[PDB]
Amino acid sequence: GPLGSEADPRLIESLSQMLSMGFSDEGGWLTRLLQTKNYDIGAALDTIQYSKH
């Protein structure tokens, strides 16, 4: 039962670009997104607009 939330070295690298671009991790949408996009900046940028529809 950890406090707050942790991250990884091969993950924060991506978030650094998102947060600077104008994003965040409210709720945990950018804490797992990158992990699913193989820590990508161009793929994560197109994961906020929508999902399928």
Coordinates of all heavy atoms in Angstrom, one line a residue:
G1 N 0.8 -1.2 0.0 CA 0.0 0.0 0.0 C 0.8 1.3 0.0 O 1.0 1.9 1.0
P2 N 1.4 1.6 -1.2 CA 2.3 2.8 -1.3 C 1.5 4.1 -1.3 O 0.3 4.1 -1.4 CB 2.9 2.6 -2.7 CG 1.9 1.7 -3.4 CD 1.3 0.8 -2.4
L3 N 2.2 5.2 -1.1 CA 1.5 6.5 -1.0 C 1.7 7.2 -2.3 O 2.7 7.1 -3.0 CB 2.1 7.3 0.2 CG 1.1 7.8 1.2 CD1 0.8 6.8 2.3 CD2 1.6 9.1 1.8
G4 N 0.7 8.1 -2.6 CA 0.8 8.9 -3.8 C 0.8 8.0 -5.1 O -0.1 7.3 -5.4
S5 N 2.0 8.1 -5.8 CA 2.2 7.3 -7.0 C 3.6 7.3 -7.4 O 4.3 8.3 -7.3 CB 1.3 7.8 -8.1 OG 1.6 7.2 -9.3
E6 N 4.1 6.2 -7.9 CA 5.5 6.1 -8.4 C 5.6 6.1 -9.9 O 4.6 6.0 -10.6 CB 6.1 4.8 -7.8 CG 7.2 5.1 -6.7 CD 8.4 5.8 -7.2 OE1 8.9 5.4 -8.3 OE2 8.9 6.7 -6.5
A7 N 6.8 6.1 -10.4 CA 7.0 6.1 -11.8 C 8.3 5.3 -12.2 O 8.9 4.7 -11.3 CB 7.1 7.5 -12.4
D8 N 8.6 5.3 -13.5 CA 9.8 4.6 -14.0 C 10.7 5.5 -14.7 O 10.3 6.6 -15.2 CB 9.4 3.4 -14.8 CG 9.7 2.1 -14.2 OD1 9.7 2.0 -13.0 OD2 10.0 1.1 -14.9
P9 N 12.0 5.2 -14.9 CA 13.0 6.0 -15.6 C 12.8 6.0 -17.1 O 13.0 7.0 -17.8 CB 14.3 5.2 -15.3 CG 13.9 3.8 -15.0 CD 12.6 3.9 -14.3
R10 N 12.2 4.9 -17.6 CA 11.9 4.8 -19.0 C 10.5 5.2 -19.3 O 10.0 5.0 -20.4 CB 12.1 3.3 -19.5 CG 13.4 2.7 -19.0 CD 14.6 3.5 -19.5 NE 15.8 2.6 -19.6 CZ 17.0 3.0 -20.1 NH1 17.1 4.2 -20.6 NH2 18.0 2.2 -20.1
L11 N 9.9 5.9 -18.4 CA 8.5 6.4 -18.5 C 8.5 7.9 -18.3 O 7.9 8.6 -19.2 CB 7.6 5.7 -17.5 CG 6.2 6.2 -17.5 CD1 5.4 5.9 -18.8 CD2 5.4 5.7 -16.3
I12 N 9.1 8.4 -17.3 CA 9.1 9.8 -17.0 C 9.7 10.6 -18.2 O 9.3 11.8 -18.4 CB 10.0 10.1 -15.7 CG1 11.4 9.6 -16.0 CG2 9.4 9.4 -14.5 CD1 12.3 10.7 -16.4
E13 N 10.5 10.0 -18.9 CA 11.1 10.6 -20.1 C 10.1 11.1 -21.0 O 10.2 12.2 -21.6 CB 12.1 9.6 -20.8 CG 11.4 8.4 -21.3 CD 11.0 8.4 -22.7 OE1 10.8 9.5 -23.3 OE2 10.8 7.3 -23.3
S14 N 9.0 10.3 -21.2 CA 7.9 10.7 -22.1 C 7.0 11.8 -21.5 O 6.8 12.8 -22.1 CB 7.0 9.5 -22.4 OG 7.7 8.5 -23.2
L15 N 6.6 11.6 -20.2 CA 5.7 12.5 -19.5 C 6.4 13.9 -19.6 O 5.7 14.9 -19.7 CB 5.6 12.1 -18.1 CG 4.8 10.8 -17.8 CD1 5.5 9.8 -17.0 CD2 3.4 11.1 -17.2
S16 N 7.7 14.0 -19.4 CA 8.4 15.2 -19.5 C 8.0 16.1 -20.7 O 7.9 17.3 -20.6 CB 9.9 15.0 -19.5 OG 10.5 15.3 -18.2
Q17 N 7.7 15.4 -21.8 CA 7.3 16.1 -23.0 C 5.9 16.4 -23.0 O 5.5 17.5 -23.4 CB 7.6 15.2 -24.2 CG 8.9 14.4 -24.2 CD 9.7 14.5 -25.5 OE1 9.6 15.5 -26.2 NE2 10.5 13.5 -25.8
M18 N 5.0 15.5 -22.4 CA 3.6 15.8 -22.3 C 3.3 17.0 -21.4 O 2.6 17.9 -21.8 CB 2.9 14.5 -21.8 CG 3.2 13.3 -22.6 SD 1.8 12.8 -23.7 CE 1.6 14.3 -24.7
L19 N 3.8 16.9 -20.2 CA 3.6 18.0 -19.2 C 4.1 19.3 -19.8 O 3.5 20.3 -19.5 CB 4.4 17.6 -17.9 CG 4.2 16.2 -17.3 CD1 5.3 15.8 -16.4 CD2 2.8 16.2 -16.6
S20 N 5.2 19.3 -20.5 CA 5.8 20.5 -21.1 C 4.9 21.0 -22.3 O 4.9 22.2 -22.6 CB 7.2 20.3 -21.5 OG 7.8 21.5 -22.0
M21 N 4.3 20.0 -22.9 CA 3.5 20.3 -24.1 C 2.1 20.9 -23.7 O 1.4 21.6 -24.4 CB 3.3 19.1 -25.0 CG 4.2 19.0 -26.2 SD 3.9 17.5 -27.2 CE 4.1 16.3 -26.0
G22 N 1.7 20.5 -22.5 CA 0.4 21.0 -22.0 C -0.5 19.8 -21.5 O -1.7 19.8 -21.9
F23 N 0.0 18.9 -20.7 CA -0.7 17.7 -20.3 C -0.4 17.5 -18.8 O 0.3 18.2 -18.2 CB -0.4 16.5 -21.1 CG -0.9 16.6 -22.5 CD1 -0.1 17.1 -23.5 CD2 -2.1 16.1 -22.9 CE1 -0.5 17.2 -24.8 CE2 -2.6 16.2 -24.2 CZ -1.8 16.8 -25.2
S24 N -1.0 16.4 -18.3 CA -0.8 16.0 -16.9 C -1.1 14.5 -16.7 O -1.2 13.8 -17.7 CB -1.7 16.8 -16.0 OG -2.0 18.1 -16.6
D25 N -1.1 14.1 -15.4 CA -1.4 12.7 -15.1 C -2.5 12.6 -14.1 O -2.6 11.6 -13.4 CB -0.1 12.1 -14.5 CG 0.1 12.5 -13.1 OD1 0.2 13.8 -12.9 OD2 0.3 11.7 -12.2
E26 N -3.5 13.5 -14.2 CA -4.6 13.5 -13.3 C -5.4 12.2 -13.4 O -6.0 12.0 -14.5 CB -5.5 14.7 -13.6 CG -4.8 16.1 -13.6 CD -5.3 17.0 -12.5 OE1 -6.4 17.5 -12.6 OE2 -4.5 17.2 -11.5
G27 N -5.5 11.5 -12.4 CA -6.2 10.2 -12.4 C -5.3 9.0 -12.8 O -5.4 7.9 -12.2
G28 N -4.4 9.3 -13.7 CA -3.5 8.2 -14.1 C -3.7 7.8 -15.6 O -3.7 6.6 -15.9
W29 N -3.8 8.8 -16.4 CA -4.1 8.5 -17.8 C -2.8 8.6 -18.6 O -2.7 8.1 -19.7 CB -5.1 9.6 -18.4 CG -4.5 10.9 -18.6 CD1 -4.4 11.9 -17.7 CD2 -3.9 11.4 -19.9 NE1 -3.8 13.0 -18.3 CE2 -3.5 12.7 -19.6 CE3 -3.7 10.9 -21.1 CZ2 -2.9 13.5 -20.6 CZ3 -3.1 11.6 -22.1 CH2 -2.7 13.0 -21.8
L30 N -1.8 9.3 -18.0 CA -0.5 9.4 -18.7 C 0.6 8.5 -18.0 O 1.7 8.5 -18.4 CB 0.0 10.9 -18.7 CG 1.1 11.2 -19.7 CD1 0.6 11.1 -21.1 CD2 1.6 12.7 -19.4
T31 N 0.2 7.8 -16.9 CA 1.0 6.9 -16.2 C 1.0 5.5 -16.8 O 2.0 4.8 -16.6 CB 0.6 6.9 -14.7 OG1 1.6 6.1 -14.0 CG2 -0.8 6.3 -14.6
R32 N 0.0 5.2 -17.6 CA -0.1 3.9 -18.2 C -0.1 4.0 -19.7 O 0.3 3.1 -20.4 CB -1.4 3.2 -17.7 CG -1.4 3.1 -16.2 CD -1.0 1.7 -15.7 NE -2.1 0.9 -15.1 CZ -2.0 -0.3 -14.7 NH1 -0.8 -0.9 -14.7 NH2 -3.1 -0.9 -14.1
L33 N -0.6 5.2 -20.2 CA -0.7 5.4 -21.6 C 0.6 5.2 -22.3 O 0.7 4.3 -23.2 CB -1.2 6.8 -21.9 CG -0.9 7.4 -23.3 CD1 -1.7 6.6 -24.3 CD2 -1.3 8.8 -23.4
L34 N 1.6 5.9 -21.9 CA 3.0 5.7 -22.5 C 3.4 4.3 -22.4 O 3.9 3.8 -23.4 CB 4.0 6.6 -21.7 CG 3.9 8.1 -22.0 CD1 4.1 8.3 -23.5 CD2 2.7 8.7 -21.4
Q35 N 3.2 3.6 -21.3 CA 3.6 2.2 -21.2 C 3.0 1.4 -22.3 O 3.5 0.4 -22.7 CB 3.2 1.7 -19.8 CG 4.1 2.2 -18.6 CD 3.5 1.8 -17.3 OE1 2.4 1.6 -17.1 NE2 4.5 1.7 -16.3
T36 N 1.8 1.8 -22.7 CA 1.1 1.1 -23.8 C 1.5 1.5 -25.1 O 1.3 0.8 -26.1 CB -0.4 1.2 -23.6 OG1 -0.7 2.2 -22.6 CG2 -1.1 -0.1 -23.2
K37 N 2.1 2.7 -25.2 CA 2.5 3.3 -26.5 C 4.1 3.2 -26.6 O 4.7 3.8 -27.4 CB 2.1 4.8 -26.6 CG 0.6 5.0 -26.4 CD -0.1 4.1 -27.4 CE -1.5 4.8 -27.7 NZ -2.2 4.1 -28.9
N38 N 4.7 2.3 -25.8 CA 6.1 2.1 -25.8 C 6.8 3.4 -25.5 O 7.8 3.7 -26.2 CB 6.5 1.5 -27.1 CG 7.9 0.9 -27.1 OD1 8.1 -0.1 -26.4 ND2 8.9 1.5 -27.7
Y39 N 6.4 4.2 -24.6 CA 7.0 5.5 -24.2 C 7.2 6.3 -25.5 O 8.3 6.7 -25.9 CB 8.3 5.2 -23.6 CG 8.3 4.1 -22.6 CD1 9.2 3.0 -22.7 CD2 7.5 4.1 -21.5 CE1 9.2 2.0 -21.8 CE2 7.5 3.1 -20.6 CZ 8.3 2.0 -20.8 OH 8.3 1.0 -19.9
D40 N 6.0 6.7 -26.1 CA 6.1 7.5 -27.3 C 5.5 8.9 -27.1 O 4.6 9.0 -26.2 CB 5.3 6.8 -28.5 CG 6.3 6.2 -29.5 OD1 6.9 5.1 -29.2 OD2 6.4 6.7 -30.6
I41 N 6.0 9.9 -27.8 CA 5.5 11.2 -27.6 C 4.5 11.6 -28.7 O 3.5 12.4 -28.5 CB 6.6 12.2 -27.7 CG1 7.8 11.7 -26.9 CG2 6.2 13.6 -27.1 CD1 7.5 11.4 -25.4
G42 N 4.6 11.0 -29.9 CA 3.7 11.2 -31.0 C 2.5 10.4 -30.9 O 1.5 10.8 -31.5
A43 N 2.5 9.3 -30.2 CA 1.4 8.4 -30.1 C 0.5 8.8 -28.9 O -0.7 8.7 -29.0 CB 1.9 7.0 -29.9
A44 N 1.2 9.3 -27.8 CA 0.4 9.8 -26.7 C -0.3 11.1 -26.9 O -1.3 11.4 -26.3 CB 1.4 9.9 -25.5
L45 N 0.2 11.8 -27.9 CA -0.4 13.1 -28.3 C -1.8 12.9 -28.9 O -2.7 13.8 -28.9 CB 0.5 13.9 -29.2 CG 1.6 14.7 -28.5 CD1 2.6 15.2 -29.6 CD2 1.0 15.8 -27.8
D46 N -2.0 11.7 -29.4 CA -3.3 11.3 -30.1 C -4.0 10.3 -29.3 O -4.6 9.3 -29.8 CB -3.0 10.8 -31.5 CG -4.0 11.3 -32.5 OD1 -5.2 11.0 -32.3 OD2 -3.6 12.1 -33.4
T47 N -4.0 10.4 -28.0 CA -4.7 9.5 -27.1 C -5.6 10.2 -26.1 O -6.1 9.6 -25.1 CB -3.7 8.6 -26.3 OG1 -2.7 8.2 -27.2 CG2 -4.4 7.4 -25.7
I48 N -5.7 11.5 -26.3 CA -6.5 12.3 -25.4 C -7.8 12.8 -26.0 O -8.9 12.9 -25.4 CB -5.8 13.6 -24.9 CG1 -4.3 13.3 -24.9 CG2 -6.2 14.0 -23.5 CD1 -3.6 13.6 -26.2
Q49 N -7.7 13.1 -27.3 CA -8.9 13.5 -28.1 C -10.1 12.6 -27.9 O -11.2 13.0 -27.5 CB -8.5 13.6 -29.6 CG -7.3 14.5 -29.9 CD -7.7 15.8 -30.4 OE1 -7.8 16.0 -31.7 NE2 -7.9 16.8 -29.6
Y50 N -9.9 11.3 -28.2 CA -10.9 10.3 -28.0 C -10.3 8.9 -27.9 O -9.1 8.7 -27.8 CB -11.9 10.4 -29.2 CG -11.3 9.8 -30.5 CD1 -11.6 8.6 -30.9 CD2 -10.5 10.6 -31.3 CE1 -11.1 8.1 -32.1 CE2 -9.9 10.1 -32.4 CZ -10.3 8.8 -32.9 OH -9.7 8.4 -34.0
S51 N -11.2 7.9 -28.0 CA -10.8 6.5 -27.9 C -11.1 5.8 -29.2 O -10.2 5.4 -29.9 CB -11.5 5.8 -26.7 OG -10.8 6.1 -25.5
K52 N -12.3 5.6 -29.5 CA -12.8 4.9 -30.7 C -13.7 5.7 -31.5 O -13.5 5.9 -32.7 CB -13.5 3.6 -30.3 CG -12.6 2.6 -29.6 CD -12.3 1.3 -30.4 CE -11.6 0.3 -29.6 NZ -12.1 -1.1 -29.9
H53 N -14.7 6.3 -30.9 CA -15.7 7.2 -31.5 C -15.1 8.6 -31.7 O -14.3 8.9 -32.5 CB -17.0 7.2 -30.8 CG -16.9 7.6 -29.4 ND1 -17.5 6.9 -28.3 CD2 -16.2 8.6 -28.8 CE1 -17.2 7.5 -27.2 NE2 -16.4 8.5 -27.4

